[PDB]
Amino acid sequence: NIGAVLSTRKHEQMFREAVNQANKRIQLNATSVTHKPNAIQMALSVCEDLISSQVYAILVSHPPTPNDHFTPTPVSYTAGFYRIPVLGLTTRMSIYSDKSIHLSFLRTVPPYSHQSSVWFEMMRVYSWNHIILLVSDDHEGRAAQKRLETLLEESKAEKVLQFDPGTKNVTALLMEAKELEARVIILSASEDDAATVYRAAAMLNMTGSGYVWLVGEREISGNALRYAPDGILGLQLINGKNESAHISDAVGVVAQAVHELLEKENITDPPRGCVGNTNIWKTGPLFKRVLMSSKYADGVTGRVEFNEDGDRKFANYSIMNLQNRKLVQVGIYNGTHVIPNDRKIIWPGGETEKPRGYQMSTRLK
Amino acid sequence: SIGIAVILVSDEVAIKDAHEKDDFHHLSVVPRVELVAMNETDPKSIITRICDLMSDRKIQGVVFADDTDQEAIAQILDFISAQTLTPILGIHGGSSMIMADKDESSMFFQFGPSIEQQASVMLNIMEEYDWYIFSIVTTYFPGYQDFVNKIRSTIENSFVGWELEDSKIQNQLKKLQSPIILLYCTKEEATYIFEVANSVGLTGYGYTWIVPSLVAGDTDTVPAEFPTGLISVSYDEWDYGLPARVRDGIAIITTAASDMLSEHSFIPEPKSSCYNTHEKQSNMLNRYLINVTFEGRNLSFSEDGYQMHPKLVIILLNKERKWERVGKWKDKSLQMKYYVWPDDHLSIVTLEEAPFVIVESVDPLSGTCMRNTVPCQKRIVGYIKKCC
Amino acid sequence: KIQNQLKKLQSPIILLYCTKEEATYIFEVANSVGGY
Amino acid sequence: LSTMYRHMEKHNYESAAEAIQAVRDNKLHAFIWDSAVLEFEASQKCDLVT
Amino acid sequence: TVPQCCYGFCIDLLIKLARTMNFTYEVHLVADGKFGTQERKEWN
Ligand SMILES: *[C@@H]1O[C@H](CO)[C@@H](O)[C@H](O)[C@H]1NC(C)=O
Ligand SMILES: *[C@@H]1O[C@H](CO)[C@@H](O)[C@H](O)[C@H]1NC(C)=O
């Protein structure tokens, strides 16, 4: 309904193509497109663009900055200040869903706090027992640990649950894990923290000695793989690698929501100027409810089903095993079920069979 | 020293006079005097005012005040700290309210109690009322897990044990029918929640609901269908004036700056008046600004945005769209003039008569009594009720 | 009024005898309120 | 038993040995809820009755 | 933490159970000496 917002020229072209496709198939009006590389400047730039567009429609993607921590935060705050629901493309961050501070900051790609159901299904299929989970000191790690604990309540095991802020010298967690004698561990943190954990595990001579575990999608990066050993069963998004596909789905969802809301006669007029925005939007909750209720049968991302918090229940993730410093996609789990037997999983130790989680536990205090 | 300013969206002309009249015996460098006046509710105007203040002089911290009920503006103020690495102070209105899980690297100070403080106040009120919740009902809201965790921690720490227990919500309310009900939802959801409660019957004189700040932020235009008897917790709704709050904030900022200068020997200053001026030394002053003492009262606070001695008030909604301002929370102490709250009212005279009434002492640990006794309004030779 | 009385008396057994047209509203109210 | 717990809690002992030593000097009225050690104190010491 | 001697009914029962189950144990006392309680969500 408003002008498209994108970071790069290719993203702008993709957004324009998606808008044209939506208009070809209740009309989207656009006047100009603008963006800023600085978050502080972008906070005012997005407000100015929304004011000039005379419409409430904001949908941006994540910047290519390596940090990817607080660059889109001011834009999200500006979008959530009013009653203007927004949709994020290729924005997999669990910080937004950890506290739900924003009004309707919904992303098609599930955040890092999700995918614990896939881990639970894998553990049930492989009958894994006596596993521990390490969560980063950030809010995203705490939320992921809480979700995993909630989904593991039939039991689980005595997880270390170390804070792990990301210090250079961190050996207490490794010592505790060795003492607990847990074959399967679940670690999810930042790239630097994951690299430090892998280095500590390698220095302990226990990374590939009868210990086979799995890792999340947060640490899936080239830098982490350069130091991590083989035999790691990481997770990857089904279609989150490229953002050129989610833009079409977002445009279609926005068009469907606009068509659904056009029936209602309580449509408000956004202010022409940003300064003259004393009035508070009141139809925003209704639009958010309509968007949550509305769903797409198919598309680039397939079936989309918003959860209670507003997260798409795609439940699709590809499991990649590490062998000879190479990633092999041995099937993919869709709908939180078993994955196809594309390739045989090989443990880092060298045994084809999955080692038992509760093994080598005789002495007790 | 500090180029703080007060923005009123209301005149507050006495704030500058109070700040100037404040002594600087313990202050190393006298602060700069600057005031910014604007009437807008947009991020662009706030950004322009901040840029103008930074260009005029070194702010190193600003105080924001507002008259609207939009608390989210305070959250934007937190982002302002992320754009300046400087503390932001609140006086009244949106800035007074404290957001949920707003703690981050950027420093932010608010005069409103957090979720944990509100839960503690509600628990103290329920202990004074000698009633128990015995019913768990929480709607889908961002401030849900924190409130439940705080309530669980409070009931676990407390020596006295606590009982634990449109069609779906009505059935849940009927199954969990209790005289004390805790709820947290938005006003739009509260409109249907009140109707559901009235239909079920908990809105009558058989149960009471507690909505501290979720809906009853300002109970001046309460709906007619809203049941009478509910109470709310506010942060100096009609007790602390805006100029007084501004003066207290200025004094706290000056004391924090003096402490930082004493502990670091180098007062930080903004690089320039640009958006990315400080994009290139900020935690040193934040680590000392938390322990701030001014006006003969320590204002120590944590990253959650609480108060060491909050001026919490209790408003009791009535059937005539009126709320009682009686209630104080000085020095984290519980006291009120309506402790005994409700031809169903009777007065019974009771004497000692040895074994029939042998209890004559009240536990001073919290001012309450046991779970198998009653209050006894003894004579003045005022209303100091003991345990019977 | 009727809903409050129905919710107050949450007995497993409820007896009612009236005209079907009037009984329909009572049954709808009881179902909305809510084993028994 | 709420009235028998809060009102009579400040006199508790953190260890059974301290309670036994206190009661051996007639400094304690009675001690209960320790049958594991009371089945031996009343037998070996034969100085108190249960 | 001087190593003291642990013997009696409970120690003998634990030793017999360990011998029957072929388990290795390291018995030790508790510095606090409390029997266990739930003080202020965590067992202290
Ligand atoms: C810190 O010191 C060295 C440096 O890595 C390391 O070997 C050691 O285990 C660390 N100790 C602790 C307690 O972190
Ligand atoms: C604050 O600092 C003063 C002295 O600088 C000290 O006496 C006081 O204990 C401190 N308070 C806190 C809470 O750290």
Curated annotation (Swiss-Prot), chain A:
Disulphide-bonded residues: C47-C274
Cellular localisation: Cell membrane; Postsynaptic cell membrane; Postsynaptic density membrane; Synaptic cell membrane
Superkingdom of this protein's organism: Eukaryota
Glycosylated residue positions: N29, N169, N205, N242, N266, N316, N334
Coiled-coil blocks: none
Record's comment on post-translational modification: NMDA is probably regulated by C-terminal phosphorylation of an isoform of GRIN1 by PKC. Its phosphorylated state is influenced by the formation of the NMDAR-PPP2CB complex and the NMDAR channel activity.
Consequence the record notes for mutating D193H: In NDHMSR; uncertain significance
Spans within the Extracellular topological domain: 1-365
Subunit and partners: Heterotetramer; the NMDAR subunits are modular and harbor tiered domains that function in concert to regulate opening and closing of the cation-selective ion channel pore. Forms heterotetrameric channels composed of two GluN1/zeta subunits (GRIN1), and two identical GluN2/epsilon subunits (GRIN2A, GRIN2B, GRIN2C or GRIN2D) or GluN3 subunits (GRIN3A or GRIN3B) (in vitro). Can also form heterotetrameric channels that contain at least two GluN1 subunits and at least two different GluN2 subunits (or a combination of one GluN2 and one GluN3 subunits) (in vitro).
Family under the similarity heading: Belongs to the glutamate-gated ion channel (TC 1.A.10.1) family. NR1/GRIN1 subfamily.
Function description: Component of N-methyl-D-aspartate (NMDA) receptors (NMDARs) that function as heterotetrameric, ligand-gated cation channels with high calcium permeability and voltage-dependent block by Mg(2+). NMDARs participate in synaptic plasticity for learning and memory formation by contributing to the long-term potentiation (LTP). Channel activation requires binding of the neurotransmitter L-glutamate to the GluN2 subunit, glycine or D-serine binding to the GluN1 subunit, plus membrane depolarization to eliminate channel inhibition by Mg(2+).
Name used for this protein in its record: Glutamate receptor ionotropic, NMDA 1
Gene (UniProt): GRIN1
Full-protein positions shown: 28 to 399 of 938
Curated annotation (Swiss-Prot), chain B:
Molecular functions per Gene Ontology: amyloid-beta binding; glutamate binding; glutamate-gated calcium ion channel activity; glycine binding; ligand-gated monoatomic ion channel activity involved in regulation of presynaptic membrane potential; NMDA glutamate receptor activity; transmitter-gated monoatomic ion channel activity involved in regulation of postsynaptic membrane potential; zinc ion binding
Any single GO BP term: positive regulation of synaptic transmission, glutamatergic
Keywords per UniProt: Calcium, Cell membrane, Cell projection, Chromosomal rearrangement, Cytoplasm, Cytoskeleton, Disease variant, Disulfide bond, Endosome, Epilepsy, Glycoprotein, Intellectual disability, Ion channel, Ion transport, Ligand-gated ion channel, Lysosome, Magnesium, Membrane, Metal-binding, Phosphoprotein, Postsynaptic cell membrane, Receptor, Signal, Synapse, Transmembrane, Transmembrane helix, Transport, Zinc
Tissues showing expression: Primarily found in the fronto-parieto-temporal cortex and hippocampus pyramidal cells, lower expression in the basal ganglia.
Glycan attachment positions: N39, N291, N298
Post-translational modification remark: Phosphorylated on tyrosine residues.
Impact when changing C376R: In MRD6; decreased protein abundance; decreased localization to the cell membrane
Residues holding Zn(2+): H92, E237
Stated consequence of mutating C387Y: In MRD6; decreased protein abundance; decreased localization to the cell membrane; changed glutamate-gated calcium ion channel activity characterized by increased glutamate and glycine potency and increased open probability
Chief localization: membrane
GO cellular component, one term: postsynaptic density membrane
Intervals, Extracellular compartment: 1-388
Disulfide bridge partners, by residue number: C51-C274, C369-C387, C376-C388
Subcellular location: Cell membrane; Postsynaptic cell membrane; Cell projection, Dendrite; Late endosome
Family: Belongs to the glutamate-gated ion channel (TC 1.A.10.1) family. NR2B/GRIN2B subfamily.
Protein's name in the database: Glutamate receptor ionotropic, NMDA 2B
Organism field: Homo sapiens
Primary gene name: GRIN2B
Full-sequence portion shown in this chain: 34 to 457 of 1484
UniProtKB/Swiss-Prot annotation, chain C:
Family stated for the protein in its record: Belongs to the glutamate-gated ion channel (TC 1.A.10.1) family. NR2B/GRIN2B subfamily.
Protein's recorded name: Glutamate receptor ionotropic, NMDA 2B
Free-text note on domains in this protein's UniProt record: The extracellular N-terminal domain (NTD) endows NMDARs with a unique capacity for allosteric modulation, harboring several binding sites for small molecule ligands that act as subunit-specific allosteric modulators of ion channel activity.
Associated pathology: Intellectual developmental disorder, autosomal dominant 6, with or without seizures: A disorder characterized by significantly below average general intellectual functioning associated with impairments in adaptive behavior and manifested during the developmental period. MRD6 additional features may include seizures, hypotonia, abnormal movements, such as dystonia, and autistic features. Developmental and epileptic encephalopathy 27: A form of epileptic encephalopathy, a heterogeneous group of severe early-onset epilepsies characterized by refractory seizures, neurodevelopmental impairment, and poor prognosis. Development is normal prior to seizure onset, after which cognitive and motor delays become apparent.
Coverage span on the entire protein: 215 to 254 of 1484
Function: Component of N-methyl-D-aspartate (NMDA) receptors (NMDARs) that function as heterotetrameric, ligand-gated cation channels with high calcium permeability and voltage-dependent block by Mg(2+). Participates in synaptic plasticity for learning and memory formation by contributing to the long-term depression (LTD) of hippocampus membrane currents. Channel activation requires binding of the neurotransmitter L-glutamate to the GluN2 subunit, glycine or D-serine binding to the GluN1 subunit, plus membrane depolarization to eliminate channel inhibition by Mg(2+).
